[PDB]
Amino acid sequence: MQLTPFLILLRKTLEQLQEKDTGNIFSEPVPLSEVPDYLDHIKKPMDFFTMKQNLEAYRYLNFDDFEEDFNLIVSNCLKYNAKDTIFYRAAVRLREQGGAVLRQARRQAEKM
Ligand SMILES: CC(=O)c1c[nH]c2c(C)cccc12
């Protein structure tokens, strides 16, 4: 399949995922200066800005590459934050709502 339509699709999909994160809690890396124990629990931080950089660096060449980093955003947040927090529930909401975005986008990629 052709590269350019695939990257256009991933850009649109990433924008749709960011729209689901209405608090923008996943827009940029977790600020390690404020959370010095974060790396004690989380081996690979991820966020939507880093995903955009990876996309434009041609690091995502199949849908799994892209969805893996999305899943890291969600799983890191569930792991680090207590269940009774807004942050934890925001990851649950993103998993549910972003999952639906991802399933339709993957289907578009399969038509290529
Ligand atoms: C997504 C996430 O876990 C966080 C985003 N910002 C945070 C902050 C500021 C502290 C702890 C966790 C987070």
The amino acid at 2: Q
CA distance 98 to 17: 6
Q: Tell how far the Cα of 100 is from the centroid of ligand 1, in angstroms.
A: 24
Q: Which domain holds residue 7?
A: 1-112
Rounded to 10 degrees, what is the CA torsion of 35, 36, 42, 48? 50
Instruction: Count up the domains in the chain and report the number.
Output: 1
* Residue nearest to ligand 1 atom 13, measured at CA: 30
Alpha carbon 90 to its chain centroid, in Å, reads 13
Alpha carbon 64 to its chain centroid, in Å, reads 12
> Can you give the CATH number for the domain in which 83 is found?
1.20.920.10
Q: Which residues contact 17 (CB under 8 A, 6 or more apart)?
A: 48, 70, 94, 98, 101, 102
CA distance 42 to 60: 22
- Residues 56-88 as b/e (b if ≥16 CB within 10 A, e otherwise) read eeeebeebeebbebbbbbbebbeebbeeeeeeb
Resolution of this entry, Å: 1.3
Radius of gyration of the chain (CA): 14
Q: Tell how far the Cα of 87 is from the centroid of ligand 1, in angstroms.
A: 7
